[model samples]
Target: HKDVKAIYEESKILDEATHLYGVQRSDIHFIADAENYVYELKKDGESFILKITHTIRRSPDYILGEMEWLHHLAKGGLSVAKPIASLNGRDIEQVDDGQGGSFLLRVYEKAPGHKVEEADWNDELFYALGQYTGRMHKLTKSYQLSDPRYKRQEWDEEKLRKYVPADQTLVFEQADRLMEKLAKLPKNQDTYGLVHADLHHGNFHWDQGKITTFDFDDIGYNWFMNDISILLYNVLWYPVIPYEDKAAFAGNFMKQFLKGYREENELGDEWLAYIPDFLRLRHVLIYGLLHQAFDLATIGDEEKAMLASFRSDIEQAAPITTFDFTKLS
Candidate 1:
């Protein structure tokens, strides 16, 4: 449903955004209208991204941390969309909703490239992704935080437990068991650190052989495997290589990805055993997020079908796809 889209009126927000960025109204265009209102602003023939996030959902400090982390990665030579400070020299700015609440705002120098789609799916592309992600994990290990308030959320099973709706008792119980198992995994600099948290295709783009990642709003403290599992889960299901051939597709893709991943970081097949559990965990979390974000009754058939699929998977404990780590060296 476009219902959520109706809640936020853009005219006022765009006006204030133009003034803050010192750009004219004609220079701003609504590029994305999701949970956060995103716009593309242009001036002097240069492009910039105008992002306005829901106020209470992301606090000022939390938003600042995302920008700080992006800068950290960019400075380290990791390809990430760089955040631009507001006209006042602050990375994050605020806008009053004019309805007693507000929204968080920031701008970025648009990252270069387009999202990798089915046509772009190949062994070489996955290798680049693995390298990009591996390098980010490597940098995250040494990252020091000077500001305490900027600490992001923990993407652990505990949080997943919270997102599971109370009505899903069986699903909730399964999630509990899964979380219990995952809790026993190791946690150290090499295994766990600040992660992109949401590294799926939509959050990044591919140009030539390089990957430029953006959208760190979900960035958090978590295991590196969490990020890897998310990438695998998204790729395996969305483009959905043929059902019978999924195993072969996953094998080839992961082989190259891990090969590249290990080149920069030190994770072995040991964590591969936990991949299914994490995939199920993501299912549970997304199940709740969808219900929380959209009103099921008002949504269209396509969204409802997707939600139904998620419900079935969660209730039946269906995995996104199975991976055989033994095949990879």
Candidate 2:
């Protein structure tokens, strides 16, 4: 992560970036400076997402590639958090990084509706979520890159390898073993291509009774099953769901999501069995990131308890959603 405090103090640099979007310092509300210089901005009674990041974090070509995909998704009729052009007519603007390099500036229009909270969640939202996801996968299966330099990384290139705690030998071995298994999986246009590798509730806004996904920052070339697994794993292991209830939740979720997915595209029923394996990969990756970010001894009791809960699943061959996915279809 970047030095958030330092970035917060860089008013001149940030203001310059905000200015490029035809927004003033007073019109923007600070959101986050850690992942990227993120903010909420309002102009002419319209809301937008403002983000600034260093070239060191993502190359200019990579950023352009991300925007290209967003534009394409929108063109293909996906309700996405579409990128908005800067005052310069370029979707992305570059500003001085304050250290001889530069930081890329970007803005995306806010989704048309409220970010549906857990209370707003229901079976309808679940199906909508899956339908939107299915459309993205279908679109991406034929997504052609504008340039070779715009090609994103693959799943095996994930930065988690270095993040696993030094003592977590089991995690390291399991991660590598999972990598080996993934490498052995067949890849073809129908089943493998660009994917929104991190599509989940947090990255989307449920607006007008549908999902508008954002944050293509983790886009990658991987099996389509991984995308499905990532979304399912997030709903299952993350936030507030209890371990014992996951099986029941998965049953309903699988039935409904597949209903939506089938309307847009079809994946072989065999891939449903691979969901468990991908869930394990997502679990291991999260463990490594948590260990890298904080010391267990220093975190809150509730936080430590959550990690322990995840560890139980981490020790297994796959996560605890003991429902038949194939039956859902």
Candidate 3:
């Protein structure tokens, strides 16, 4: 679905990028291409990330919204990698791609911390995850775009069909119906606003006494409930936990997570009841993304096995956890 690999002219892009941010070419090192072309670089003697995105994936207005939102979050004392302005005094830049679309470029101060390990993980981390998440929701409720033109995309704008397997009609059918259900949900200041749509464990690092999150590339407008379910969904996706152990894990996570969550913000406990629906929705969303995010032919045996099992889980409506989410209330 993405033609970036064929289009990206690396050395050329990097040369311009280095000049834009006042960094030498040697300081910028390519890191990952999972969704965007991400790089680790140094600017002003401090570590930062240089991310190259595409206009096809996000419009200039949407990207503008994302950068400003990150700035706002950082200013609010949320632990996130703050956006770094380029030499031109711009938070974002557009390099003409010669194919009508432009390449989007931005940088961020590298967030501090280390990825959590299972050996040292416990309720405290989960509690902090929720605490940070809750603070995000609370902070965003007061977020006002500096320019009226800047606004993030809606949750419904994702192109699931383009990413999902072309033949999975059943999956699309369920996705469409589930989205319709989500659309009918109430929207208000506390319930819906801009969210770090991909705040799963992988997007954040645990440092000292804080859970510092960085990747704001997936920012969007949605129910805060959606955000909550996303974190829980990915935590449950951890391969280290056995299926039989997941229920207890889920319950423990929610109890401490919401405990820490309530300390920072307030979401009606009623939304907790919708975790099952949100988890089901998360399943459909993740199932579709894996197909396009990776090179299927180059994927290893474990990923292949995981995808097969995930496909079956979607088809059979398998619940990832039988834990009573509402009981956490």
Candidate 4:
């Protein structure tokens, strides 16, 4: 926000964006904060969305994939928000700052919906989200980004051997030891197609009762089941859920999600077999994220408290040697 004001000479960017889109200034509102800036706008009696990505490097392929994949997912019958080409006809553009970390802007046709409620975790809702997820994997069967960094590659166990972060030395050490245990598990990729990488509840918005997914900011090549793990993570550990009931609901939730996913995409033999490993992977990664959050100190009160709670929970769940993978057929 400080940087934006320096760039535009104003606090709110909507005034200029409203003029650019020929929309009433009253309806323009800011909506997101991530690696980029996002806003909701209306023009000519229709609403649209805008995303401005702050470039970390010179390459634009990941952002390109974000745009392409969103469009592709929508075409595949998944309800993803559509991207609208800018007035210049380019779907994306690099905003060079002539300093460190140049940025880019991407405009999308707004998803006509409200944010999905955190409490809406019923069987039907999970099933609906799961079906769309299955469809996304099916459609992006050979999805590879133009950028090498954005492309999915088989994870090297060796990478886990040396990579360690500062805050959670204890957790990463346990992760390494657990990775040792997981080496005994079966390995297969037939069931792994396009992983959303960051497929969390917040990544999707709801239009009426229909789900319109967005935000492929961290999409990468990972186990397809990792998406399930993410679904579990947000539903089980986040703001709205109570801690004591997490385990009790896990079984019912996974069964319903898998039931819907299998309707369109088969849970391959070896892949179905590795759900536990993926779940462990998800759990391990959470420790790393929480560790980073603490080290950065850029987060607020709610997140700080939640991360502390999660860190303790994960530590106690050590060895994590017993996750039931039977739900995957």
Model 1, range 262-316, lDDT digits (tens) per residue? 8898876678877777788888777878877777558899888988898788778
lDDT ranking, best first = 3, 1, 2, 4
In model 3, state the lDDT of residue 328.
Answer: 83
Instruction: Kindly indicate the candidate among 1 and 2 with the higher TM-score.
Output: 2
List the global CA lDDT of all models: 0.78, 0.78, 0.83, 0.62
Query: Candidate 4's residue-wise lDDT over 1-329, tens digit each?
Result: 55643454223344544434455667767787655677787677787877675554325765676666666677767777777765556667555555655556667777666766656657787787777777777777755455655443343321222333456766666666666765564444445545677666677776656877766666655556766666776676563445455455666677777777877776564555655555666676765655554643476887778777656655555423244556445
Write one digit per residue (lDDT tens) for candidate 3, span 33-87.
8778999997567899989978877788978888888888889998888888889
Worst 10 residues of 1 by lDDT: 157-166
As a TM-score, model 2 comes out at 0.90
lDDT at position 272, candidate 4: 50
RMSD (CA, Å), each prediction: 3.2, 2.5, 3.0, 4.6
Q: What TM-score, computed on C-alpha atoms, does each candidate reach?
A: 0.87, 0.90, 0.87, 0.77
lDDT (10s digit) by residue, model 2, range 102-200: 777889988777666776667788788778878988998767897799888877777354654577666566677777887888898878888889867
Backbone clash tally (model 4): 0
Q: Which clashing pairs does model 3 show?
A: none
Worst window of 10 by summed lDDT in candidate 2: 1-10
